[PDB]
Each structure stands twice: as C-alpha cells, then as structure tokens.
Design an enzyme around this catalytic site. Structure first.
Site, PDB file in Angstrom:
ATOM      1  CB  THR A  16      -0.972   0.035   1.208  1.00  0.00           C
ATOM      2  OG1 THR A  16      -0.265  -0.302   2.409  1.00  0.00           O
ATOM      3  CG2 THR A  16      -2.123  -0.949   1.008  1.00  0.00           C
ATOM      4  CG  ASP A  39       9.579  -8.863 -26.120  1.00  0.00           C
ATOM      5  OD1 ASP A  39      10.758  -8.659 -26.470  1.00  0.00           O
ATOM      6  OD2 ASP A  39       8.892  -8.026 -25.498  1.00  0.00           O
ATOM      7  CG  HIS A  69      12.778  -6.105 -24.972  1.00  0.00           C
ATOM      8  ND1 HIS A  69      12.576  -4.868 -24.398  1.00  0.00           N
ATOM      9  CD2 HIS A  69      11.583  -6.486 -25.477  1.00  0.00           C
ATOM     10  CE1 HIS A  69      11.300  -4.539 -24.510  1.00  0.00           C
ATOM     11  NE2 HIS A  69      10.676  -5.506 -25.163  1.00  0.00           N
ATOM     12  CG  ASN A 161       8.969   3.246 -23.311  1.00  0.00           C
ATOM     13  OD1 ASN A 161       8.182   3.113 -22.382  1.00  0.00           O
ATOM     14  ND2 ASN A 161       9.687   2.241 -23.790  1.00  0.00           N
ATOM     15  N   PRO A 175      -8.980   0.047 -27.096  1.00  0.00           N
ATOM     16  CG  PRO A 175     -10.753   1.471 -27.566  1.00  0.00           C
ATOM     17  CD  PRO A 175      -9.738   0.594 -28.237  1.00  0.00           C
ATOM     18  CB  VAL A 177      -5.823  -4.845 -24.987  1.00  0.00           C
ATOM     19  CG1 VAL A 177      -6.353  -5.706 -26.130  1.00  0.00           C
ATOM     20  CG2 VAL A 177      -5.196  -3.543 -25.502  1.00  0.00           C
ATOM     21  CG  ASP A 200      -7.039   0.005 -19.571  1.00  0.00           C
ATOM     22  OD1 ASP A 200      -8.275   0.221 -19.557  1.00  0.00           O
ATOM     23  OD2 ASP A 200      -6.388  -0.250 -20.606  1.00  0.00           O
ATOM     24  CB  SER A 224       9.271  -2.876 -22.372  1.00  0.00           C
ATOM     25  OG  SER A 224       9.347  -4.158 -22.965  1.00  0.00           O
ATOM     26  CG  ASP A 260      -1.527   6.040  -3.491  1.00  0.00           C
ATOM     27  OD1 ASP A 260      -1.996   6.962  -2.782  1.00  0.00           O
ATOM     28  OD2 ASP A 260      -1.841   4.841  -3.348  1.00  0.00           O
TER      29      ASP A 260
HETATM   30 CA    CA Z   1      -9.130  -1.401 -21.755  1.00  0.00          CA
END
Ligand code: CA
Length: 279
Positions: A16, A39, A69, A161, A175, A177, A200, A224, A260
């Site tokens: 938290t 990837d 990566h 990035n 939208p 995913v 999201d 990533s 936060d």
């Molecule tokens: Ca979504």
C-alpha cells in the site's frame, strides 16, 4: 509467502506504500495459468525459469532471444526471483528480431497465433499475453489485439515510451486490451511513460531488475517493464480465482492503489497495480 530483498517493483505491487523491499504473494503463485510473452523470444534455459518457459513460435530463422528484452519481460512475469507469478507457464512468441524490431504484419500474425495456440496448451486457470512492444497507430494492429482478448486471453500491452498520449500508438490505443503505463520507485510517473485516456493502469517501469540472456540479470527501464508486472499480476489473480481473462484489467483497476502517483496528467488514470494480498 514473503520474498525478502525483492526487486522494488515486486515489493511495490504487494504494498500500500512505496519504499518497502519484501514481495508478498499467495503461494499458489500463478500455478495452472499461462502467460505468452510476445517479444524477442525467451531464453528458456535460464535457471531462473526452472523448466517452466518454452519457445512455441518464431517468425525468424531462430527462436532464440538474441536480444535479451523478451527474456527480461518473461523474467518479470514469472522468473523465480524476479517474477510476479513464480509458478506460471511461460510461452515465448518471437515476433521481434534480435534488434528488437518487427513488421506489424508479423506482430499481428503472432497475436492471432496465440489466440489459436492457447487451445494447444494446458492453462486451466487461464491465459495471459504480455506485449511489450508498439509503434504508430494502426487499426489492424489494434484489431489483432482486440481479437486476442476476445478469444479469451487477458491482453496486457505497453503504453509506450514517448512521454506522449498513447492514443497515437498501437496496440496501446486499443480500448479492449489492458494498456500499462510505467512508474518509478518513488511513485512518480516514469519520465518516458506515455499517458492518456487509453491507459488502464500503471506498473513499475523504471530500473527493473530481471533476467537477461547468457543466463545473466539486468536492470532496465520502460513501459515494456511495467507491462509484464500487470501480465504476471493477472495470471496470479486468475489462479487465485479472483478474476478471469475478460475482466482482469477491470479487476486490477478496481483494486489498484488510487491517487498515489505523481506527475499523472489531468485525464489519465491514477492507478497503480496492487495484488491486495493480506499475508
Ligand atoms: Ca481497456
């Protein structure tokens, strides 16, 4: 379960508050789930994967990760030391070459591959896909990400990035995913992280220690790195029975640490991935 002196990101996802170093998680640890890492591949022989990783597809002359990566991202999903879901099964799909580059057509085929391929895998607790990649807006790339999700896979994708609005990037802008921005160990939005209404959730993305090729380890930064924290979290929650592929992104947002993060642009969600685990 408690893992002391964990990478900060793991500690963050089970806390938290920032500034702690122990990762707390239910011992089930994503057992019985599967995560595809789409990837540069995965060095499945890395001791950190314990025989739980496998290359299942490549579009190049080898399935080996000649970059690192992909192996890093897989490590954050489910390596024993550096992973969120320490008992998940990891499947590598090499859509990116060893320079980390990939044609959109190949990336698309890899997404469609996973939508079918899950029917050839044993994943009773559910299936996740981690996509730490992207480029400029493409309706076709978004649609492939949408198909994969619709097929019953929890799709997590990097916001990008560019310190820019993720609406102009794909698959980030799709939208349906789960689009993941990046934060640092002081709960700041990572300086490079994209933002926008299409995001999201946020996950740890700056200075993330994980596996690398040659059986080594490495700290690197990016959306990533945030994405596989969320992918791993989804897998973990799915084995716990808390959620499903279709609703895991919503569940993660619903149960996130809220308000936060600093430097979150107006209109972007202030939500940080959190496992809500009570030891
Ligand atoms: Ca979504």
């Amino acid at each position: 379960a408690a893992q002391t002196n964990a990478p900060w990101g793991l500690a963050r996802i089970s806390s938290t508050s920032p500034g702690t170093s122990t990762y707390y998680y239910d011992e089930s640890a994503g057992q019985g789930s599967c995560v595809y890492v789409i990837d540069t591949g995965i060095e499945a022989s890395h001791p950190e994967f314990e025989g739980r990783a496998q290359m299942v597809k490549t579009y190049y002359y080898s399935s080996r990760d000649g970059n690192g990566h992909g192996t890093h991202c897989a490590g954050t999903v489910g390596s024993r030391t550096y992973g969120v879901a320490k008992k998940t099964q990891l499947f590598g799909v090499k859509v990116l070459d060893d320079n980390g580059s990939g044609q959109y057509s190949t990336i698309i085929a890899g997404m469609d591959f996973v939508a079918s391929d899950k029917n050839n895998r044993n994943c009773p607790k559910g299936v996740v896909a981690s996509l730490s990649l992207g480029g400029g807006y493409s309706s076709s790339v978004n649609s492939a990400a949408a198909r994969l999700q619709s097929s019953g896979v929890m799709v997590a994708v990097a916001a990008g990035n560019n310190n820019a609005d993720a609406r102009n990037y794909s698959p980030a802008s799709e939208p349906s995913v789960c689009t993941v921005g990046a934060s640092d160990r002081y709960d700041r939005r990572s300086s490079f992280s994209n933002y926008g209404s299409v995001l999201d959730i946020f996950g740890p993305g700056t200075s993330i220690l994980s596996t690398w090729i040659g059986g080594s380890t490495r700290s690197i930064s990016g959306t990533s790195m945030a994405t596989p924290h969320v992918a791993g979290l989804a897998a973990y929650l799915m084995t716990l029975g808390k959620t499903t592929a279709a609703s895991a992104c919503r569940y993660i947002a619903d149960t996130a640490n809220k308000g936060d993060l600093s430097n979150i642009p107006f209109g972007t969600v202030n939500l940080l991935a959190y496992n809500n685990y009570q030891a």
